[PDB]
Amino acid sequence: AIVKVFLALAAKGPVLRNCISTVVHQGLIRICSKPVVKVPTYKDYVDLFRHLLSSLNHLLYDEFVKSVLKIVEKLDLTLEIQTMIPTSDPAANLHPAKPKDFSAFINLVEFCREILPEKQAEFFEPWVYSFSYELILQSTRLPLISGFYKLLSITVRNAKKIKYFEGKYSCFALFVKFGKEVAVKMKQYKDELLASCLTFLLSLPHNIIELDVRAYVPALQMAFKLGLSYTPLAEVGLNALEEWSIYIDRHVMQPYYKDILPCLDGYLKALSRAAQKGFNKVVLKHLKKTKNISLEEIRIRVVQMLGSLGGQINKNLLTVTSSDEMMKSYVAWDREKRLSFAVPFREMKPVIFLDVFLPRVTELALTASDRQTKVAACELLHSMVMFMLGKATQPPMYQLYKRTFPVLLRLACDVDQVTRQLYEPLVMQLIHWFTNNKKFESQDTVALLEAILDGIVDPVDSTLRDFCGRCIREFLKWSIKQITPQQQEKSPVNTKSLFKRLYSLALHPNAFKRLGASLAFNNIYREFREEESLVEQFVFEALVIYMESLALAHADEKSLGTIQQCCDAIDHLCRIIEKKHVSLNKAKKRRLPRGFPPSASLCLLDLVKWLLAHCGRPQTECRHKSIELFYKFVPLLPGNRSPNLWLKDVLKEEGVSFLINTFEGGGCGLLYLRGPFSLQATLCWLDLLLAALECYNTFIGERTVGALQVLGLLKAVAFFLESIAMSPQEGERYNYSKCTVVVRIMEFTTTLLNTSPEGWKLLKKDLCNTHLMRVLVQTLCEPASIGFNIGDVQVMAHLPDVCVNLMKALKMSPYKDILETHLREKITAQSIEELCAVNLYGPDAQVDRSRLAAVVSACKQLHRAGLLHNILPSQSTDLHHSVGTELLSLVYKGIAPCLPSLDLSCKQLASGLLELAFAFGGLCERLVSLLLNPAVLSTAHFSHGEYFYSLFSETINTELLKNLDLAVLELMQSSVDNTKMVSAVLNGMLDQSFRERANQKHQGLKLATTILQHWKKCDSWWAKDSPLETKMAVLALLAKILQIDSSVSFNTSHGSFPEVFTTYISLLADTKLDLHLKGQAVTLLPFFTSLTGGSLEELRRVLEQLIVAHFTPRFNNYVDCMKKFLDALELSQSPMLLELMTEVLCREQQHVMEELFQSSFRRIARRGSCVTQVGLLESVYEMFRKDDPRLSFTRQSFVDRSLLTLLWHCSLDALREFFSTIVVDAIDVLKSRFTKLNESTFDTQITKKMGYYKILDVMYSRLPKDDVHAKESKINQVFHGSCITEGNELTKTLIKLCYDAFTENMAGENQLLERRRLYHCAAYNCAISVICCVFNELKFYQGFLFSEKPEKNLLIFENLIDLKRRYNFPVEVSTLSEEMSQFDFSTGELEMDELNRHECMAPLTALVKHMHRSLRDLPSWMKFLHGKLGNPIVPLNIRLFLAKLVINTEEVFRPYAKHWLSPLLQLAASENNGGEGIHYMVVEIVATILSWTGLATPTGVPKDEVLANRLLNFLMKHVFHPKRAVFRHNLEIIKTLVECWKDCLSIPYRLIFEKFSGKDPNSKDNSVGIQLLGIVMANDLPPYDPQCGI
């Protein structure tokens, strides 16, 4: 079916084929958004996406590729620190910024990995270049996102499956320059990211990239060592070794077998339920349902490879060098043997030396590969370490410590968590023990310290150095925490000797050897800056040695992280020299550092002169820091002098021959270089050229000196400029620094030509000569001719910013026409014509598309240059530029055919070409005349038009939006005859303004308010004989313009608000829309319910007409329309919707949509701003109070289920003005008299009284006692002014009034009972809720509400209880949410049976629990209930009420069942319970009387004895019940009863005898008696047949 509809909308036109590619891109986000570890994750759908590709396969292929790279653009996957000094790359970095986007990524890579592993025999060749290059960009910006290597490995395995590599050319160089870049980069990674990187690297061809095999061998001998625990990369290693050795020729491979091969030596070392019952077809069921690599194939592959390899090659497998570390494990650990263990038996106790199972224990502890043996070896090693430490305290062990101690570290930060919370306090404890004066200056301590330091400076264990840093921090902390400083003056473990260790580390010529010292200082700068008399001596010589180490760290690698740590190591010390030396300089002796001339005082001035003297280093990462320390170390000499004046103070009394040797260096001075190569002197001079080029670059652009006082080199650069246009393995290293320095030249020229010498072209006229205007015109256009490489992406995209900044800052010199006349050899427009051929998109691939791409890139930067009308002016016709109109018309003609074609990058060219062609002037009137066009394009049809819109709908829109405010008028001019096109284009501009809502905020609102006042000239839409799709387009546009707008255009007639509201009234009033097409209309309520009177009568009238008109797929219509009005009312707040919909909710008893009503009312009550909630409260009170003769059901239901919830759910904690205006608003109708004249004014007056009672109930309930009972605006409200009475003027006159209610007899009054009961009950609830809220502390609960005085016939209970109803009683039973919502913008406790729904029970139990958890028999609220129940003279309904009372709160009646024991059992024993005797109430009351067993026995009482015996005879009489489980339930009840009470229980007989005595054995009606006999034989009871029993 899915492929049927995808064939349906694919064979009619290209205007509708675009639907087929906007559906699938949407479906991918629909299924790639699920959870990842029941909802399926991503898995079941792979059957669908495999099945689809079965023409239409090609179309859904290209749709899948465009949609698979259109997600990976916009996810902003940049992870973030969320929390030591870390060294690893995702060390504590391992936290994404938005987590629900990463789970949209690692869902995506696996899905593409399983859908596109094949069926690419024809359809992946023209898709590899762009895929590879954009993935290379996103992976270069984001290295450590595991998965870009995964998608790249997919495309490169596909790039080996298709041939593609006979050497189209352009991908062959970025793979090389990326392969070497990942191969250098991947050292400092860990498990998953490294695994993905290796399966990238070894998937590269290398029988075509057989060049430079020497760098990848550590990416093959690391896959095999990373085998043995994880199989598939151990398989990709073996297949890499199988595809290298066969196709590489055997003279270049053969030296590289000594070290691939010796690491190939870890490899020569219901179902059963139906299956137990035979084989009879149900094993065929459980087998037919469930039917729709491992290391032994690896090992046999290894042996077959060694055989097929050779005979003289083959035996390298053990003799690479044959003495490395096997012997260093196969030697001892000592000479002598110590650690004598006297294993104690009873009398012998011999010895065993615990050394000979040390080298097995301290390997078992690290790599056991079994969880149970690892904790065993770890525990033994822990106790053995404690033993060997305690051994030496009553025997020198410093040959044993030296290889025990580098394993406690490697354990204490390894992986596991139990194994890690073990050995961390141990390694702290041995530090805290060896640093002590009781064991001071011992040779084990230096073994521990060297273990720490070689823990720091070590190649590949990235999570170990940052534990050794914390060790050195703790070591430095305890080196002064426990040694007295006057006995801390002498020892080699002092801080100074540790500092010398740090510097000697800090000057070794490998990177790891001084990165350790930088991490040590990064970890200890938090220390030592809080202790005085120590900062000012040696660490204040450490600054300049750290600068020199940063200088030494030049040549290593950018992506190792030596710069990134040493720069921090000096920054966090610069922030401590600029804290205390700002206010102190006592110029005594200090520590003289390395590289200075010596002196006797070292205050600051030598160092800042050194910073100014060492600014001309060629060390490209300490020159920058010396500059940016010079700029901050000028203003601390006591004049606080700015750099502008200070250099002029010191310069002139030193001279211009002082400020020129540093800036020029030894780099003044040959033309051997007709071949650009890398004789290593060339690089050091080129580095010197750069240093001398970039020293001036900051001081000229700063205000210390200008162009005069240093110039007064420039020949050397003009020597260079004839040479810059000019070993393929290291010649590119020279080519890097050859094509690096020209942008430093350009930055220098701009930062001199823009600054303070404005009127100065005084530079030499042979380095701004035609040399620079030849290399600039070869840098911009065609930069891959001067020696640029294709494959860098940083500089190859930073270049058109400085190369256009230079064309910017080259106009305020007289070289303006110099540039124009020098550029004008190609950029005359006739050349642009002669490249604009007729065959741009045809059979050719690069040969002219590239040659027009070069020129449009060039002139796009020329439009960006701030200068284009000097270059090319208009053909002298008018303000439409001629070649631009030629380009735009050629793009118009470039789509018409019998049939044309299209691609991806050709459309990139056709987009950029028009993006150039729009950049000249206005042209937009031509643009809308081209959009709106009635032209007829026939195909063997369509009007193209919107074809040309739908192709380019991201350039055309911003070209419209650039020239706003007149494009709208030029657009609305043709709204009569091109109605579909102007609706389409305006909706396009609208949803393009909304889609960048987070950016601009002006243009969408301005477009809305400009089009809202222009409705008067597009009025031919919403009238008669314009059928109901036109109006639907009008109302969709209404939804757009009124969903985007701010609160400016529609309130109080700002724009043309009369016209727009008459449009909405005329669109809703008609009969064309049936019901639910105006659902889009009725969503638009709150932008029209923002208004005062006037139009509201018409709006409420048409709403009334709607309601009286429109009120299985018809029940669904009821459901959706009711939810429609409810959700509209949910977000609006105006009390017109509420007063409309509550008229139509309140019509029946229990509407089926009632939970939606109460839920959305709950959503209404809490929305803040108490002035409008209390407005709704006044709306519902006045609509309840007024004199409309409403129905008693309706008038009742108003106050029942309209405002009670809104006063319940969350009204306000301090809304009491409604309580201030309700008091003498309701007490007047409360205190009236029953005029029994007609029954309507009788009972409607009653319902008004009930409504008063209920609202007083809810307002009395949820308040503290102060604002009902104290000096507040309750007494100050109901009385006059501010009175002196305390609180007792409202409570007593409410209490006496509610107690005067519900005591009225109705002996002669039978006119009305069914509602007078409800009035009496509501008055009772009001009484309860006022009395619990007043005081609640003394002899008033017994007095009031209870113990009436029946002398004048007072009747509390039996009045309010019903006493006529036969109670029924049956027997027993991110960012993808945005791109998924943009698709939506542009389209569209107890149980309740009978006695708990009695509208008194829950407040009664609340009062009973309130009596218990607030404060024989009791006062009068118990003894009265005790006598109330045991007399069989009340009718059963009230006794049953009190029984349901005592079951629900039995926790408070269990301490007094020694009196409450008879009448419950009297209710069960007296054969009175109605019908056949209700058994569920009986099982409930017997349950609660046997519940408190052990107290108040059912045994002994002479009434209760015979009552329990007749109880038991009844119970055993009624048991049978043909339902199966209630039989067993009743039997368990009888078993419980005889097993509990069984003492005064006289056992019954002859009923069991008559039970099983039945003859005719063909029905099972004897089982009951024998099962009852088993019940009685189980405990203690014999068949005591001597009786009246037989």
Curated annotation (Swiss-Prot):
TPR repeats: 1112-1135
Residues with the N6-acetyllysine modification: 281, 648, 1349, 1555
Region Leucine-zipper, annotated ranges: 902-937
Stretch list, region Interaction with C1D: 902-937
Localisation per UniProt entry: Nucleus; Nucleus, Nucleolus; Cytoplasm, Cytosol
PTM entry text: Autophosphorylated at two clusters, the T2609 cluster and the S2056 cluster. Autophosphorylation induces a conformational change that leads to remodeling of the DNA-PK complex, requisite for efficient end processing and DNA repair.
HEAT repeat windows: 443-479
Signal sequence coordinates: none
UniProt subunit comment: DNA-PK is a heterotrimer of PRKDC and the Ku dimer (composed of XRCC6/Ku70 and XRCC5/Ku86). Formation of this complex may be promoted by interaction with ILF3. Component of the core long-range non-homologous end joining (NHEJ) complex (also named DNA-PK complex) composed of PRKDC, LIG4, XRCC4, XRCC6/Ku70, XRCC5/Ku86 and NHEJ1/XLF. Additional component of the NHEJ complex includes PAXX. Following autophosphorylation, PRKDC dissociates from DNA. Interacts with DNA-PKcs-interacting protein (KIP) with the region upstream the kinase domain.
Annotated disease: Immunodeficiency 26 with or without neurologic abnormalities: A form of severe combined immunodeficiency characterized by reduced or absent T and B cells, recurrent candidiasis, and lower respiratory tract infections. Some patients show dysmorphic features, severe growth failure, microcephaly, seizures, and impaired neurological functions.
Family assignment from sequence similarity: Belongs to the PI3/PI4-kinase family.
Role played: Serine/threonine-protein kinase that acts as a molecular sensor for DNA damage. Involved in DNA non-homologous end joining (NHEJ) required for double-strand break (DSB) repair and V(D)J recombination. Must be bound to DNA to express its catalytic properties. Promotes processing of hairpin DNA structures in V(D)J recombination by activation of the hairpin endonuclease artemis (DCLRE1C). Recruited by XRCC5 and XRCC6 to DNA ends and is required to (1) protect and align broken ends of DNA, thereby preventing their degradation, (2) and sequester the DSB for repair by NHEJ.
Protein name: DNA-dependent protein kinase catalytic subunit
Species annotation: Homo sapiens (Human)
Entire protein: shown range: 460 to 2294 of 4128
